[PDB]
Amino acid sequence: ELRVGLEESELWLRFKELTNEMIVTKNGRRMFPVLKVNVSGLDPNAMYSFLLDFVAADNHRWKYVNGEWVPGGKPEPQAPSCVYIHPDSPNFGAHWMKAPVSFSKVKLTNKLNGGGQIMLNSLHKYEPRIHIVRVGGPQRMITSHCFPETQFIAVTAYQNEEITALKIKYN
Ligand SMILES: CC(C)N(C)S(=O)(=O)N1CCO[C@H](C)C1
């Protein structure tokens, strides 16, 4: 059976219990912590691409009000995020299972850009999600996995200084 697991969950849970924030910039900012995924149960000889997107967890704008995050009154439909292709893609099952798949080079932006960068809406809450994509033929398959532990609000600067401190402590 194809098994997907989060590497360093105990660390992500420190961020999650404070409400996690990720910086977005015009040119794009890399994530900390980095999403790292443990994958077993692939065909070592089959061909796969690893894809990363961000699901809007709710339809609301969030704001830091008197030391705490609160959702706004007026929900809007959240268009799905664009997909980031892991740069090792496409690759053999063996490549993906030999070490954690690390999305260290994805950059989160707030502006529509040349490409590479993934544009998110600031003050929206996101749930990272991967798609493992077995390419070509009649054996083609997608398996998707969400990482609730890795939820964050996109921000142009940190609001909760406890997050600022954890980011620095562990970087
Ligand atoms: C676009 C193309 C290169 N593919 C990844 S596919 O094999 O035709 N394909 C797309 C949907 O997911 C499955 C893996 C089947």
UniProtKB/Swiss-Prot annotation:
Residues 11-171 bind DNA. It is linked to Neural tube defects: Congenital malformations of the central nervous system and adjacent structures related to defective neural tube closure during the first trimester of pregnancy. Failure of neural tube closure can occur at any level of the embryonic axis. Common NTD forms include anencephaly, myelomeningocele and spina bifida, which result from the failure of fusion in the cranial and spinal region of the neural tube. NTDs have a multifactorial etiology encompassing both genetic and environmental components. This is T-box transcription factor T. The chain holds residues 41 to 211 of 435 of the full protein. Involved in the transcriptional regulation of genes required for mesoderm formation and differentiation. Binds to a palindromic T site 5'-TTCACACCTAGGTGTGAA-3' DNA sequence and activates gene transcription when bound to such a site. It is found in: Nucleus. Detected in testis, but not in other, normal tissues. Detected in lung tumors (at protein level). Monomer. It comes from Homo sapiens. The lineage of its organism: Eukaryota, Metazoa, Chordata, Craniata, Vertebrata. Disulfide bonds: none annotated. It comes from the Eukaryota.
